[PDB]
Amino acid sequence: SDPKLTKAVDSICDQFIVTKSKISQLTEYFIDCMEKGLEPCEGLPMIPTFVTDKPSGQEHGVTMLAADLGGTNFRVCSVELLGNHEFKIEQEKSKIPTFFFQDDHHVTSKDLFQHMALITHQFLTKHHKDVIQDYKWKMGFTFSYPVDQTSLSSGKLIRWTKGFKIGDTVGQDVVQLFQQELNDIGLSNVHVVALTNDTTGTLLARCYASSDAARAINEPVIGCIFGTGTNGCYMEKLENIHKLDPASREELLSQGKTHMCINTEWGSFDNELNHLPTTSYDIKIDQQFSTNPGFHLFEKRVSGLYLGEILRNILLDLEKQELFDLKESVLKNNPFILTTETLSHIEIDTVENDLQDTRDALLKAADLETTFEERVLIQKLVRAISRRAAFLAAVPIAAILIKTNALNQSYHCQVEVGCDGSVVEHYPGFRSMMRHALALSPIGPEGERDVHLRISKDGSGVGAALCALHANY
Amino acid sequence: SDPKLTKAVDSICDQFIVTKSKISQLTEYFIDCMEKGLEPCESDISQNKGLPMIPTFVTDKPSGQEHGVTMLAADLGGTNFRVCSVELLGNHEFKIEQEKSKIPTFFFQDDHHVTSKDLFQHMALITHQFLTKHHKDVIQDYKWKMGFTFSYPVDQTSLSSGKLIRWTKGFKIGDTVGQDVVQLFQQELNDIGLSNVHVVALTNDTTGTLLARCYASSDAARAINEPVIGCIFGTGTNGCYMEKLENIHKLDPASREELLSQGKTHMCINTEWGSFDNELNHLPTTSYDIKIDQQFSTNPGFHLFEKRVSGLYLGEILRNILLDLEKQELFDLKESVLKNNPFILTTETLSHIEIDTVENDLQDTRDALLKAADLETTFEERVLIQKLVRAISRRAAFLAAVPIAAILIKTNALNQSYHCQVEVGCDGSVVEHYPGFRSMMRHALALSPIGPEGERDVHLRISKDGSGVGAALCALHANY
């Protein structure tokens, strides 16, 4: 209907295409960054988590509690391990005040961890009134942030993310700080025994929830997240974790341990952009509309937070060319007004319904009245953004499986990949497009059929509880 | 160690291979038998060369968001009677209470003058006893909708009307033959004061496997991930799917039009694919499949496809191969007890061999054969026995995939949306528990006409208890 605008959209969509050649390149380059990352500091982060055992699913008769500090909520839960892949969970939820995300000179780290301590006291008083001060509680702490973890219960914050501005916390042991405030309110009997990442929890949770005899050939190997951010972990041979001091590496091998879970934090993959597909829109977003410019570049191309923003910048560039009319819309100066959920309604909308689900999504999101011919092109852009995100999201998984020869161990060898996150859970077709990229990746179609992307929820709870199980009070 | 025996086994293993060329042939021939089976009776063949293709009269699928309601189900097997209550909690979750009971021996006696009334009166009392136990307070107020699972040959004329054809599994009640079992069961439910319990549905256990997965399909949104097939792969096999009302030409036009007038568009078809290609025009066949179908079978000449996929016969096939290898002085059975003990080799025995590794001298296989038939073996023998087991199981999984691929192709299930995906509800000792069976099925699906891109959009998820929860869910969308 409008050949001028149409040709413009066709050109932009082609910039988001990820060819089989590129998947091979990025998969090979990812393994290179993996090995470089396993060396002493001077590649990927590659952070040892010090988790060496996998839950069997038969741990029972014990009750653990765990604390999870997300980006917008604080969470306290109690996980009763009942064995047979079943568990009871009770919890109390608390919001994080908004003044912690601004750089108020009056807000400090202590005020944050004191907030966490009081909620613990309020939660324990709610469900376990009789054992609040006597029980020898073992607590698992899920701190889904960049951390330089030196042991299972010691980790200093490296840098805040997800909109946080508290400088006094950086470079300080977050577990000890949290423990300092738990003693002050009279809960000295609560010992923070484990410091885990949310990916480490996603994996252990699926190990406990997996099947007894199916796991003889179907072993969970990766725990990853695809939501506001992205990150993944896997088990690595102790011999390859050169960051680990040899004494501790030797001590674990002599104890029957063979692997240790590595928190790759692959969101920081190829921060130099030697190979990641990049467009003027990814650059304009990385420098201006980013909270930590220059960091987590791979995450910004796959995170559900930035997917909506990418579309917005495309439309603004199209208005600059007098091709698209925003009229009374409110996109001109409203970053992140386009959300991952908004695009979801566009992904699966049908042209048989004049793309009605998309018109309403745009009106509700930015009062942007549209025509049928416009939504058809907007749909093409959304489907191209999601497809690149799903294709890139497959590279880390394929690289990890290749580097560990997980797919060729037995006659009927299969592997599971635990996933959690608004994108992979609910964004329509995301997993479907991931499986497609896995088929185009070096593992091949025969490799994908032996890979199962099963979703495992509540990693920050059961997973953190299991880490405290094998820890000493 | 023995090149003669090795070469013999490699030749036998090659007889069980199913090539991509064959998968296309069988998938295409299956759809032909599907269409022939849907035509009016008495055409070329007495009832068409095609499959049975039996309408179940189930037209609605649970959405998974139904809540606040409790449904009942009754299941009459060969040796037990079962009554359960399924409370739907929405969000793909549900509560289930049940009581299972043995069938009194008085029904198996001779000369006692047993009649249908005596049987359904017992079922009514058991139902009343169950409702008094778990739903004491609402037994007489609730408008209970019950689904009836009657595991016997039935001529189903509607969703709630079906006449018994013949007793099986050791039953002798003449009053039942040719009578609506739903009406009989309903007659006695009214007498004991449960007139408010309406048997609204008479269901098959395969149809329930599908409906059960419809409610439990929580992973994907149904806008693009719709369950389409419910099948069974255990001792027997069978599957079902939704067919357009217009293609069920055997269906009476009067009943067909009335359903169209209610907004219904599809009806679940009980294919009974176990009887697929009983003429063996194309089904892979070996001397072992023939000797087992005629001698060690209970119904020779019938259910040929079922005997190629049933977990019961997989172990037997191995036995006949080893006996044939001993008859040729190639394999030494020694003190084994295979000579006259059919089915002594079970699917469970083969399971330990399927995934056993040669890195451990195949010890799980050495032990499995000793416990099963006191057959002492050598390492070189177990290597070949494993090759035979893995070849037999692979043929069964490849053949089990043909019907699924055939149904998906005939219904364009994979080409409905941009991100269209489908689920297949499965139950059965073989598909559920035989190691790798599901994995080899997906491989055959990739080699089938749907292609590898089609397999990635097919999900073989397991849905248990079709004759209980499934029968209850069928009654959900049925009218009181």
From Swiss-Prot, chain B:
ATP binds at K100, D465, G466, S467, G468, V469, G470. Keywords: ATP-binding, Glycolysis, Kinase, Nucleotide-binding, Transferase. Residues 63-203 are annotated as: Hexokinase small subdomain. One of its GO terms (biological process) is intracellular glucose homeostasis. Transmembrane segments: none annotated. Residues 3-476 form the Hexokinase domain. This is Glucokinase-1. Glukokinase specific for aldohexoses. Phosphorylates glucose and mannose, but not fructose. Residues 145-171 are annotated as: Glucose-binding. Residues 204-465 are annotated as: Hexokinase large subdomain. Pfam families: Hexokinase_1, Hexokinase_2. One of its GO terms (molecular function) is mannokinase activity. Pathway: Carbohydrate metabolism; hexose metabolism; Carbohydrate degradation; glycolysis; D-glyceraldehyde 3-phosphate and glycerone phosphate from D-glucose: step 1/4. It catalyses: D-glucose + ATP = D-glucose 6-phosphate + ADP + H(+); a D-hexose + ATP = a D-hexose 6-phosphate + ADP + H(+); D-mannose + ATP = D-mannose 6-phosphate + ADP + H(+). Belongs to the hexokinase family. Its EC number is 2.7.1.2, 2.7.1.1. InterPro entries: ATPase_NBD (IPR043129), Hexokinase (IPR001312), Hexokinase_BS (IPR019807), Hexokinase_C (IPR022673), Hexokinase_N (IPR022672). One of its GO terms (cellular component) is mitochondrion. CDD domains: ASKHA_NBD_GLK1-2_fungi. It comes from the Eukaryota. It is an enzyme of class 2 (transferase).
